[PDB]
Amino acid sequence: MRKLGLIAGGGALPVELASHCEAAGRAFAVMRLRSFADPSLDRYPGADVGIGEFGKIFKALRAEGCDVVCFAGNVSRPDFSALMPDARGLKVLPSLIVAARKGDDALLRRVLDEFEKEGFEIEGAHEVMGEMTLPRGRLGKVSPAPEHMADIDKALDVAREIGRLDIGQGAVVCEGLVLAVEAQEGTDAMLRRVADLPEAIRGRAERRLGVLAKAPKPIRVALPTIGVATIHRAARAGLAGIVGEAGRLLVVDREAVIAAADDLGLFVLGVDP
Amino acid sequence: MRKLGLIAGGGALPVELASHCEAAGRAFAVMRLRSFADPSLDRYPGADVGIGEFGKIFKALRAEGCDVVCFAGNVSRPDFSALMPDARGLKVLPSLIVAARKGDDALLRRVLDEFEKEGFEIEGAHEVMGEMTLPRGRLGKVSPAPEHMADIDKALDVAREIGRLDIGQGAVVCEGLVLAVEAQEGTDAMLRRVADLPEAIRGRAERRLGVLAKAPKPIRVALPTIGVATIHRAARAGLAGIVGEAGRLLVVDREAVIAAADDLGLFVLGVDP
Ligand SMILES: CCCCCCCCCCC[C@@H](O)CC(=O)N[C@H]1[C@@H](OP(=O)(O)OP(=O)(O)OC[C@H]2O[C@@H](n3ccc(=O)[nH]c3=O)[C@H](O)[C@@H]2O)O[C@H](CO)[C@@H](O)[C@@H]1OC(=O)C[C@H](O)CCCCCCCCCCC
Numbered sequence: 001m002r003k004l005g006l007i008a009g010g011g012a013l014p015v016e017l018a019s020h021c022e023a024a025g026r027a028f029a030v031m032r033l034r035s036f037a038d039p040s041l042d043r044y045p046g047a048d049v050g051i052g053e054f055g056k057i058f059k060a061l062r063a064e065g066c067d068v069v070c071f072a073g074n075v076s077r078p079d080f081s082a083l084m085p086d087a088r089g090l091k092v093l094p095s096l097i098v099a100a101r102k103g104d105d106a107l108l109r110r111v112l113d114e115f116e117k118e119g120f121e122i123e124g125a126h127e128v129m130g131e132m133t134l135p136r137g138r139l140g141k142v143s144p145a146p147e148h149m150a151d152i153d154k155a156l157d158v159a160r161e162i163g164r165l166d167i168g169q170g171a172v173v174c175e176g177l178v179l180a181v182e183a184q185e186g187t188d189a190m191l192r193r194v195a196d197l198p199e200a201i202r203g204r205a206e207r208r209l210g211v212l213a214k215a216p217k218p219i220r221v222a223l224p225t226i227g228v229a230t231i232h233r234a235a236r237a238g239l240a241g242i243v244g245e246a247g248r249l250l251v252v253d254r255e256a257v258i259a260a261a262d263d264l265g266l267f268v269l270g271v272d273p
Numbered sequence: 274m275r276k277l278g279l280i281a282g283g284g285a286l287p288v289e290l291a292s293h294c295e296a297a298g299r300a301f302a303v304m305r306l307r308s309f310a311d312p313s314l315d316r317y318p319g320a321d322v323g324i325g326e327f328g329k330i331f332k333a334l335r336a337e338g339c340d341v342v343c344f345a346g347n348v349s350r351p352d353f354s355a356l357m358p359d360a361r362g363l364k365v366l367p368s369l370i371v372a373a374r375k376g377d378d379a380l381l382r383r384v385l386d387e388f389e390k391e392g393f394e395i396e397g398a399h400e401v402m403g404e405m406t407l408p409r410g411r412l413g414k415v416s417p418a419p420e421h422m423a424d425i426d427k428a429l430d431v432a433r434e435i436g437r438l439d440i441g442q443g444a445v446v447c448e449g450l451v452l453a454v455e456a457q458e459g460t461d462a463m464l465r466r467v468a469d470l471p472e473a474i475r476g477r478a479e480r481r482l483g484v485l486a487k488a489p490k491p492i493r494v495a496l497p498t499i500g501v502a503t504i505h506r507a508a509r510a511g512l513a514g515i516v517g518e519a520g521r522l523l524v525v526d527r528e529a530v531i532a533a534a535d536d537l538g539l540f541v542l543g544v545d546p
């Protein structure tokens with residue numbers, strides 16, 4: 001439970017720790033990922049890291065005084081060819097590019113284990129799970145109706161098997177029919193596709209059918225995330241709700257998520273893994 | 274090998290038999306599916322069938338003189354509530370709506386077996402497989418490079434497992450990464466999504482990486498189809514080629530498909546099931 005070194009991806013999380021770093025006074029250090037990091041993190045202690053500057057990040061976290069790092073934010077796999085220069089990233093690079101061939105987890109695997117080599121003992125999940133994780137049972141006031149339990153179990157099953165092939169982690173099931181499965185497009189894009197599907201095979205704004213399920217990605221530090229946008233994007237699609245495994249989903253801004261889900265009439269539910 | 278009764282879906286196939294029915298002189302009868310059938314099939318012998326007019330289609334094929342029917346064209350599952358009226362379709366309806374809950378094959382299953390009850394012995398595949406099926410090995414002049422064989426085996430594997438869950442039948446793999454998987458959106462929409470993905474994880478117009486694979490849907494009469502549009506839609510996405518199981522893919526307009534694939538530099542290849 002030592003602290004802190006922040007490897008900045010993109011999106012709210014990296015600010016949702018800066019807001020939280022205003023608490024304990026670590027004082028954190030932000031390794032801003034040059035290509036992803038928000039400028040709301042401009043001139044916090046730390047540096048700007050080209051995602052290839054693998055050895056600069058190491059000397060920087062070391063420099064400041066870091067023994068414990070947290071991976072927050074959205075990151076994409078690079079187009080490797082066009083990568084930035086750093087000679088320390090090479091001793092481990094092939095084992096990345098090679099694991100990159102497996103999937104978006106075998107790559108993530110090597111990178112994080114690579115840190116653990118350098119003496120940095122890390123855990124990005126527990127730092128943020130004890131703040132903003134999905135709890136068991138409903139999150140808002142809406143519960144699932146009987147007419148929604150079968151889609152719940154099935155959406156989840158599909159998400160898990162899609163998830164073990166390293167394809168994606170999200171899937172959408174309406175009345176037993178799988179409407180969509182997430183790959184590289186992202187959850188928002190996937191929900192958008194669903195709303196675009198003919199109404200004959202989906203719910204609508206006054207009779208909601210269907211569930212979005214996100215799940216890992218089997219045994220964590222990178223876990224499937226949802227936020228407010230997910231709610232109304234889920235809503236447009238006609239979905240009745242969203243499910244995840246308890247302690248295996250990140251809910252950014254859980255109160256506005258609660259507010260939004262409730263007004264729209266959508267459950268959000270954490271099932272037991 | 275008797276003939277003929279044509280259950281008209283939509284798209285070229287139902288005309289690609291009318292063109293072919295100009296041959297043997299059956300003379301065919303077209304049960305135009307009221308909601309899908311092209312008007313290029315207006316006033317050919319036969320009728321106009323509301324997809325729910327299940328008993329009208331039966332009396333009509335019987336009326337004309339049909340003992341052998343062929344299912345050609347694209348069809349969607351209806352929004353059942355808004356269906357058209359026919360009292361003969363009811364004795365079998367629940368077993369449709371019920372099988373509809375499984376997937377877009379358990380439903381297709383019951384419907385076609387339902388015909389086989391009425392004395393109509395059918396086979397829509399062999400009628401069209403002996404004209405326009407995918408042959409083993411390349412179809413055009415382009416072959417796959419070494420750099421494309423691993424995506425070929427993997428795209429196929431994924432298509433098959435996606436296919437056994439009754440999700441979809443198409444998938445797209447580029448350098449080992451699954452870019453996309455088809456569900457209800459359709460192949461064209463799926464290829465469009467891929468072209469929309471960041472270029473960092475896909476091929477491009479001068480260095481083509483990746484494969485689209487379509488496959489059944491395990492043991493046929495309804496088989497995954499491709500045509501010219503598939504070629505240039507595949508092309509925009511940066512794909513290097515398209516693969517299917519020999520005798521388990523329909524190639525509409527195989528010569529224009531050949532012409533198009535070749536100019537664009539894309540292989541099309543039938544592997545052994
Ligand atoms: C050579 C370089 C090699 C680098 C390795 C490249 C590996 C490529 C694959 C890595 C793995 C990567 O695909 C996954 C990833 O980056 N994780 C992050 C990812 O979650 P996800 O489920 O993939 O998002 P999704 O968009 O599908 O649905 C969200 C919905 O919510 C909504 N949403 C989101 C944010 C928000 O503020 N509000 C909101 O409503 C939004 O509208 C959506 O409806 O977006 C979430 C939103 O922010 C983050 O919380 C999460 O963050 C995490 O879970 C942790 C994160 O994975 C750490 C970064 C990976 C490791 C980086 C270390 C390597 C750098 C080292 C350099 C020296």
Ligand SMILES: CCCCCCCCCCC[C@@H](O)CC(=O)N[C@H]1[C@@H](OP(=O)(O)OP(=O)(O)OC[C@H]2O[C@@H](n3ccc(=O)[nH]c3=O)[C@H](O)[C@@H]2O)O[C@H](CO)[C@@H](O)[C@@H]1OC(=O)C[C@H](O)CCCCCCCCCCC
Pocket residue numbers: 280282283284285286322323324325326327330344345346347348349350351369377378380381384459460461494495496497498499500501502503506523525
């Ligand atoms: C209560 C009513 C219950 C009704 C049951 C509803 C079941 C719902 C699910 C049924 C199963 C249904 O999803 C599948 C289906 O309808 N099959 C048909 C379906 O193939 P698919 O692979 O699903 O197309 P896809 O769009 O994903 O990629 C294509 C690419 O090619 C390109 N393309 C296409 C056409 C063309 O002319 N040119 C071209 O370049 C195009 O740009 C694309 O890049 O589109 C192809 C393009 O036309 C047809 O060749 C095929 O046709 C078949 O294989 C046979 C067809 O499945 C027979 C119809 C099903 C049985 C109907 C009997 C029920 C009625 C009885 C009433 C009494």
